[PDB]
Design a binder for this molecule. Structure first.
Ligand code: 5FD
Ligand code: 5FD
Ligand code: 5FD
Ligand code: 5FD
Ligand code: 5FD
Ligand code: 5FD
Ligand code: MET
Ligand code: MET
Ligand code: MET
Ligand code: MET
Ligand code: MET
Ligand code: MET
Lengths: 291, 291, 291, 291, 291, 291
């Protein structure tokens, strides 16, 4: 009973996703196709990455992630399929997802198939990989790919073949590490004991504000759950609050909460109100934090 | 073949819904997960309720409704799980749903699991219940729950255990009626022959206008299909038309129709044009009807 | 393993689609309901037709297409249900969908059920039909249908009975060809040797621009892939470029590609950048093209 | 434009072949069905094999060979489908087929589907194979197969699915080499300088006589075009003539020609008269050659 | 992509069939012409009927059957074209042909054109008809028909016009039921619980023996698949065997098998050997069966 | 939509024809190969000529006729390829083939390719020719042709190149009229006012008897349709009857018709009964006829 979890930039306004879904049931009739999300900003591979990197621990082993934004559609470029290593713990503590102590997940248990455009950068950085292959076999892609729709032709279609049991090694030749494209993610800067980063994203639809300053960064400045923090956004907004587990820890509705979000990252928001929407806060603004 | 129908405020712009889905297929491999909607205004429990209250009669017996907006996420509060009594007839006429005479649903046949923040107020009012429990058992919720994601930890996850056959009485201790939180429903006031109420919702994406004046409120004042009616929104804009069953009864395209919506409530629209969107009509505006 | 592909104008903001789905599982427990889209402009039948005409070749044989915008809901109008003939090749080339040489589809393999309001016009043109029937039988629609929800009562419910094996000829009497409503499809004219049409659509979320000028109109206007073309939109904005297979053929990010889309029609875009949103381009604007 | 070349023992005296053809055009509407022959002696798998073993190099890449005599029809046996390796050169000289230097055929380019009764023995010997599967999947064969017509149910029908693009590995589980049934080919014996063999076939409708002594058997004993040869059929009738490439080399009409047939095998005939038919020569009779 | 399936008595020894085929591509250039068979005993309309009555379920809807033996060639007789009603299930069980549960076929979906000499007798008896017409219009037949070749002039030619879309109703005036010629088929006699019929045919090239005692006759004597039967042929040959699905159920090669043939009729044969050819069994000999 | 009409002496008992066809689709993928016949007496060039002379008026313009018996296969002989002139009326009357007034065929519209052994004699007499060429070019025949299969190497392969548009004049040098081999066609003599010829053919499968005495020989012997005729065959068997248009003109089943066949020549038959097989009549027997 195999699952393909499908993340694209195709939107949900026309029949493009359905076209892929139809081909997924044509090829693997007993497949369950779980939508991740299709709303991402087109061609923004750093954002697409955000929506896929935390997925594996939540799915049954054998799940295939089909993840694509494909600006080089119609070119000699060919996709990449990789088996990941660690399923990886996650969240604010670092733990397995699920009831009890959680579903512990085996190694080598999930496959990603994506354009070779850097979309899987963080996936590989945070999980590792056991093997990678270029996707060129006409048993899993079309002989005549539709030039402008490689997200269906070089991702959806082969993802269903893999989901139906088609051997990963037979999709094409192995790829060396340097042949897999990456983007570089900027580091969290240091010193003064302060940490300098950015707003990775606005957490829709709440308007929470997410930074790229991970828990591991907070640790190794000695920052923990009682610490009176000062987090400055956009160079001019020095918010001040203790680091708390959650939103209601700020007291009244509307108050400020500095917390670790559900993916392990330092964040700021308001208790049952929007921080970012009234003040038009945006991804890309700076983010410093300190004692 | 179990189903879980899933209503949240999580949105469809990132992978949050998909994390919960991955866990629901993990716990209950045969499940079908049906999306209700994930767009509701965050923290707005009266809005959440309109999306879930009419559902039971449409779904197969056995269906579980995971319904969640969780502003108290990370606190010591705990979710509630209830087996509802009557599936209840609905619509502008009062009937079972489906082809023929409709599909009649046995009592005690559906379970809702939600935050105990009042979300189920209208569900309980309209359907009753046979049993209620606080959801505390580490067999159906995580030992270490993610503080900012209780909609996944305390609704999505145990909704999957219930779909799988985990006995309802084993999720936690019984809740007494007064321990279940409720919102107060603003009453429809009498004021001469005029019934005063409120625009409960704009009916997206058409721009139809729904009030909280029920058909039982109408057939209390002797108003039935065919009476001429004045209807005053925001105190200032009145509207005259007969009460008809549907939009095409208004004559030309654009003409005003006053009707009973598919949930039994008095409503007003234009025939195949939007009424709300040109005039920026909004929920919360008053609504006065009179014959 | 039956499939229903569901296209409506119901939106995804409330529980309307899910009520339809609940009754689809009720009637055909083993069904898979695939969403096409639900975001279309209400009552815009030409737009609905673009989202459903190209689907068949992507879906397993036996698939039912529930496709509906129902402005006449509550009237004595009754739906139409057809078995189409040729599943029809598509795309820029004119091929079957799938890996390798694509998957061919036996004729008479798909049913569309829809309102008799012309929504199926282009499906019938592009595919032909073997049978067509009024949907009146109480075995497959309600005896007392909800006046304002015919997309559920005369499309969603019937489609499920058909997915479950219910005989197509038993839904009601046959219709003759003249009783199937069509919208007339405005032709691409010639003003000299320049071709004159409309922007059929803004291809969200990318902001590409699609025209109603087909590949067949370019052939025997004497226009193939080398040709240098002047495209003018709204009778104001001119753009120049050769006709290419795809976006990256235009060179640098931001440059103009004029190309043929995955449905066969002349289109225009920027390479990995939006063209429609900065210049606020829209559906319905004239589109002229010369060599 | 897919082709299926169809070899059976069904005859051409009733509609049996046409039932299979009707189903092949049904499943794969673009197919061209090319008859091989339908006259073979029923149940004679060695005869069937000579008609199908030399075919691949003549046909376009992609061609599917439905080849069937099914004495085990109605039993639990199941057909085999194999992608052959080399198209292989052939003829009296060894070459690709066609105009010019001939049409060279890529490896892995043809599929045979047959009963697993040994029919493909010489195909596998002469062409090899890359993959083999048992044909069990109810997507390519009937749920309730007609007991006395497996050549239609388990060859003709799935041959059409394969022509249509149904993935070869999805027809059933992999077969290991020893699970593929084989007939034992009687060897050409050495006996001094004399090579002993057998008349493999009468070459209808000319009455030429074919042996199972190959050219590699000849050019093993140093015999080439021009040597004087004695050839003894049925132990008693000898024949003296030089080995020439063709019939006209024998001189007058009626004279004896010993030659290499178009399949590389040593043969004997008369120049523009029948040799077999006057003397009632027959397959199975011995054949001894010597220089 | 229309199909004409062509059954004649013209043989395959000269160019007569080709002459018809040439005219079929002249008139409907995109036609596929499928040979049924051309070997039938000239003027034997009962045999010709046997080769056409089971065809419809095997072909795509819209197929035209052109079926002719024409002893009244050169007379004032004119052919008949009929649309049939039921495509009809068939075989030993009674089922649709094809993979899975089979291709279900619409009503009114096939046309037969034949001399009005009784050739279509069983076609009409087993399928029914919706309309019949005499073939007299000079748009579909010659003004000057070749006196001795009405199988080309009054069948092949008009069959291609119909295949090209020419309206059936416009070939000539409607025919009343009594104006369509029939031959009478002898009933299967009854009583003693024994059933008395004949050998309908010898199943070439195997030498199986077919009777006119259908499955429906066997049913309603209570005869099924375990029954120890006694079938006497030619008044003197009381064969004795159980009724089995197929040939291999008799055990050793050469043993007797009483089975239901692939058209639903009681038959007798040997397991991988000829019953009829060694003993010169013939169509027309008697056939009784019993406990 | 090119057509090759294929007449050979290859028979239908092995894969010889199909090897030819495989290479025909290889060379001209969009071709339709129509079989004329393959059952002719090997090497009997007069008989081959009767099966091909009357074909052109039945076939779409542009059709290629691959017609071959090749007793000189393997020699330095090279095929001939001609474009004929008049497509020529035919039949008993002298008309165009087809519905209505028949279809006229432009001159220079058909090519025959055949061995230069006289097979084309009557085609050239009856049709004339505009060009004639030796087939020697390596673009259209093999460089190393199979010695015993020139019907495939110098007829089948070349015919496909010609069907695909290959220029006729480029196959090799032109031939002058004397270099095209003819068989001399034995004349119908007069012994007084009685006419003396041969049975040209037994018209299988009916057993009618065809003579080499044409309609033109009957005209100005003073013999039209009323005339009472004494036909004598083999110089022994006498038959008497008037000349009639067709078979049923003879009255009762079994009676003698003397008539004119669909190719224009005096013939004799029984009405709906065989004449040749009971009396074992044969090709080559004398045929005398007087009034
Ligand atoms: N305008 C565009 N420029 C470059 N790439 C584009 C554009 N519009 C859409 N795409 C990509 O096409 C792929 C189809 F598979 C989608 O994933 C888009 O990223
Ligand atoms: N900013 C927020 N304040 C209070 N609650 C919030 C906030 N953002 C999201 N939530 C709730 O967290 C739950 C996690 F499951 C979601 O359902 C939101 O209702
Ligand atoms: N205001 C409206 N006028 C006419 N039709 C409407 C209006 N609002 C919604 N609808 C249609 O009701 C159908 C219910 F099934 C939906 O498909 C809408 O198209
Ligand atoms: N009499 C027969 N015994 C065993 N097999 C048979 C017999 N007659 C026909 N067959 C086989 O049935 C298959 C049906 F598809 C044909 O291919 C025959 O080989
Ligand atoms: N000898 C014949 N008597 C009566 N009919 C005949 C005879 N020979 C052939 N035919 C019929 O001619 C038709 C030509 F269309 C064929 O279908 C034969 O049935
Ligand atoms: N025995 C034969 N002598 C001369 N020609 C022959 C003989 N047997 C077959 N053929 C011819 O070979 C050609 C191969 F293309 C066929 O057309 C036969 O006529
Ligand atoms: C904070 S509410 C939970 C959903 C949120 N988008 C998250 O990923 O954590
Ligand atoms: C008004 S058209 C049907 C959809 C609408 N949202 C309803 O619930 O009734
Ligand atoms: C242009 S990217 C592919 C999606 C687009 N909507 C299409 O169907 O062609
Ligand atoms: C001998 S003439 C060519 C036809 C023959 N059957 C062959 O295969 O070679
Ligand atoms: C018994 S083998 C299958 C062919 C046979 N002539 C039939 O019609 O069933
Ligand atoms: C005599 S019935 C028609 C077929 C016959 N062979 C002919 O061509 O005339």
């Amino acid at each position: 009973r195999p699952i393909i979890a499908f993340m694209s930039d195709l939107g949900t306004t026309d029949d493009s996703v359905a076209q892929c879904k139809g081909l997924m049931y044509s090829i693997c009739p007993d497949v369950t196709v779980v939508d991740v999300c299709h709303s991402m900003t087109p061609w923004d591979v750093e954002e697409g990455a955000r929506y896929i990197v935390d997925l594996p621990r939540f799915f049954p082993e054998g799940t295939v992630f089909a993840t694509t934004t494909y600006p080089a559609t119609g070119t000699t470029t060919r996709s990449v399929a990789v088996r990941i290593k660690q399923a990886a713990k996650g969240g604010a503590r670092g733990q397995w997802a699920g009831s009890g102590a959680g579903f512990e997940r085996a190694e080598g248990s999930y496959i990603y198939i994506a354009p070779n455009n850097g979309l899987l950068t963080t996936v590989l950085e945070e999980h590792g990989y056991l093997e990678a292959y270029e996707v060129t076999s006409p048993k899993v892609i079309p002989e005549q790919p539709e030039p402008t729709f490689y997200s269906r032709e070089m991702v959806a279609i082969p993802s269903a073949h893999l989901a139906a049991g088609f051997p990963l090694s037979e999709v094409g030749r192995p790829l060396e590490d340097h042949e897999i494209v990456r983007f570089n993610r900027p580091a969290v800067e240091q010193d003064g004991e302060a940490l300098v980063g950015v707003v990775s994203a606005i957490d829709h639809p709440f308007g929470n504000v997410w930074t790229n300053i991970h828990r591991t960064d907070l640790e190794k400045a000695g920052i923990g759950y009682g610490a009176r923090l000062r987090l400055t956004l956009d160079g001019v907004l020095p918010f001040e609050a203790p680091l708390t587990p959650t939103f209601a820890d700020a007291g009244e509705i509307g108050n400020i909460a500095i917390y670790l979000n559900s993916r392990g990252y330092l964040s700021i928001a308001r208790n049952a109100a929007s921080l970012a929407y009234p003040y038009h806060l945006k991804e890309g603004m700076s983010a410093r934090v300190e004692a």
